């Protein structure tokens, strides 16, 4: 297919963008590159991070917290790196026993008030980033968790207040899960690298969303080193040779109805505004040497 | 129940063998009562050879009570299994054969899966894995369908047999009750014992059909235990 | 049960209202039987105002049968919960408090786990994961221990109450049986009705304590249903 | 700790060796490198593999089937690169219906007939190769599956019942031949990236959750910087490889051993080329770092 994300730019009805995978791939570079390339043709784009690597500060040399702001060099770059532990710090006794009753309660309530802060403003689009999958993917099950929570407390200070609060959380999370499966404003991208296990857990994630009814069409890869003309490292040649072997299998599956984004590793951990602009520009014009 | 925790709580308090001995003597009356019903069934059985149809009705009910004893509540449906391995016009056995056919493609693709390599056919690896979990969901759909139908079929045929059982367990006492089955010899039994006949409306001095209903199951039951000596 | 699928299978075969009418007449005898036990309870209740201690024994047994009705076989152990939230010298409640304390360290380290990062403290990542599944196994060990002790304590106290219940349900008939509880008016009941007093050895014309044992539970039972109108 | 496998050498009462991990690591080359210096001081060593990649064809250019044999240049290299699906070939209607309640049957029968042929002879030591881990360690449930197989039934019927009873007592003694720890070992492999460290860490407590320890961990493809010559890719690759490499040094260096095995140019084939690669497992090469 077309090796870019131009179709992600072209649909004006898009609202929500999901991006993830596993570690060791540098998802933050893809995140901020996607954000800045979206800022070229969009109005109000907000980034949000919950991964405990507080990486956007390292991306821009500026401390962020629990409130959005505009950062320098841009009129559209807004972000606030937050923590999921703040709601349990708000819990810091019976609600701890409720958190023992089901292995997850407070993270969904934090996610809910996060999304209320999200829908407080009038922003155009947003993007995401997450941890490893076993702690990530339970946010799709947060409606079933809150269904179990209300089924539990319906059998179990005034309890009517927390009943009406949990009912507001119920209707809000139902609107969020309903917005998830609409697919005209919610998309998902995944990343990986040329080795076995990185490719392995990728289809596990794809069939996971297949058993939840969310498709995709775009998959990004990383560190695809193409040889310099003339100059050669002898171990780099064998690394490229084995890299193409896993590359062509991903062609052997996803060339039908998916997109492949070739991205080479650069010599520096790309920071600075202009360097991130040049790094982001390659996600529209794909570089291809003769191979 | 254990008579040991009851003794563990008997220490909390500070006669009893008199009732313990006085209770055990009552079972002798019921054992010799069934022994005299055994002797009267022997004398009722001898009287038929030298000499009607209702006794043959009880004769079939003895084999019904025997099947009640050697009941397999699953093994009746084990007879229903070969009952439904017979009919080609069965709608359900068609999908049962499609179930076994899908099991054949399941084990076939699983052989092609484990025979394949995870290195150089990774696209075929994933296509096999997708077909694997494709069929894995439709597998137990039939386990939910047919085993539901099977337990409903059991719930039908339990009552279907139970009508044939208790309809004869209550018809015999409804009809041909006043009509005397046979006359007891004059003077063998006290007046109060003869009363049993009087309550179901049959004339005094004849017997009803209860001990023939219930206690004749014990008559063949020892012959049932005779078979317990045959195989074992 | 529905009497409609039974009619759907009644078409397979080709009297019945005679048994249908003959069965319904038997309930009149038991309804007028309970109405005469109601009248004898009225006459037994009138005889106390103009006139002793065994009526107060029945008075306590009425509240025992009431608790038998409004029994919570779990809610008795709900009383046992505040029974064992009281004693500081309890060995088991000490480990129950240690259970809640370990639950506090569990949720604490789980917060420090999810608060931590999986990139640059991977050794602390694994040390947290190991402590996580370290404590996760000892968690349900106490669920196996204390809930076992709790269900055994319930099995003890069920019989511990059952002794206090049926000891009064049979001692009353053991002792003070021949000794007459009260005398029936001369000529009100036929000789055959007086049969009941004669069997427990009490003198003819007086009553025993059976209908006071079993059917007085119905006397307060309507007052029990009076409470059904109180809350609802 | 000691950067070698010397504890495996001088033991000499070992009988069983479990080495696996995840793909993309060339673990079969590590197993052959282990077995070569294994047979240098031993008498009767046998290799058994069951992974569908027939890597020993690449290892010695000599096809191995369903019988043991000896390859040239050795007196003790014995191997048979068999498939478990031959037991599925052995199963080609009640026996086929038995696959429903228990999805694994032929694998236990394969371990039966193989370990019978293994314990038929008097070989000193064996070596192994396995599939990915969730499909690997489900063989530990074979005593539980045969437990419920004997519970399922408990003269065309009772003869197989006695045969499965013989399989029962054999698998019970072999499982009793497992936790002895003086003849059964386990070595896992890894490579410097995130997920390989992740699933290796997940692997370890599984053998801890079954009462089997370990002390030997091998890594692979450890790149070394060239003096004088330099590639700009290899500098940052050395940095990333160090980043996780130092993270494992905080992990296991009190009760485990670390093996340094550097990457070579090509897939090392042939005996004499493999000998120099197998040399590094005893005398560990160390540049100034
Ligand atoms: Zn290089």
Author numbering:
A (entry chain A): 14 to 105, 120 to 183, 205 to 339
B (entry chain C), C (entry chain D): 300 to 313, 321 to 357, 1001 to 1181
D (entry chain B): 14 to 105, 120 to 181, 205 to 339
Paper passage:
The eukaryotic guided entry of tail-anchored proteins (GET) pathway mediates the biogenesis of tail-anchored (TA) membrane proteins at the endoplasmic reticulum. In the cytosol, the Get3 chaperone captures the TA protein substrate and delivers it to the Get1/Get2 membrane protein complex (GET insertase), which then inserts the substrate via a membrane-embedded hydrophilic groove. Within the membrane targeting stages of the GET pathway, the homodimeric ATPase Get3 (also called TRC40 in metazoans) adopts closed and open conformations in response to nucleotide load and interactions with other pathway components, allowing binding and release of the TA protein respectively. However, the cryo-EM structures and native mass spectrometry of hsGet1/Get2 and scGet1/Get2 show they form a 2:2 heterotetramer, which is stabilised by Get3 and interfacial lipid binding and is important for efficient TA protein insertion.
To further investigate the conformation of the GET insertase from another organism, we took advantage of the thermostability of Get1, Get2 and Get3 proteins from the thermophilic fungus Chaetomium thermophilum. A heterodimeric fusion with the flexible N-terminus of Get2 truncated (ctGet2ΔN-Get1) was recombinantly produced from S. cerevisiae and complexed with apo ctGet3 purified from Escherichia coli. We subsequently obtained single-particle cryo-EM reconstructions of both amphipol- and nanodisc-reconstituted ctGet2ΔN-Get1/Get3 at an overall resolution of 5.0 Å and 4.6 Å respectively. However, the reconstruction in amphipol additionally revealed two ~60 Å bridging helices tilted at 75o relative to the membrane normal that brace these three-TMD halves on either side (red helix). Notably, our comparison revealed the long bridging helices to be ctGet2 TMD3, which adopt the same conformation relative to ctGet1 as in hsGet1/Get2. Despite the conserved core fold, the overall morphology of the ctGet1/Get2 heterotetramer is strikingly different from the wild type human structure, as a large central membrane cavity separates the heterodimer halves. In addition, the hydrophilic groove from each heterodimer half points towards the central membrane cavity rather than to the outside, as observed in the hsGet1/Get2 heterotetramer. Finally, ctGet2 helix α3’ and the adjoining TMD3 N-terminus form the sole contact between ctGet1/Get2 heterodimers with an interface of only ~120 Å2, binding the opposing ctGet1 TMD2 instead of the ctGet3 TABD. Superimposition of ctGet3 with hsGet3 demonstrates that these changes are caused by a ~17o twist and tilt of the ctGet1 coiled-coil. Nevertheless, the structures of the wild type C. thermophilum and Δα3’ H. sapiens GET insertases represent analogous, alternative conformations of a largely conserved membrane heterotetramer, which we define as state 1.
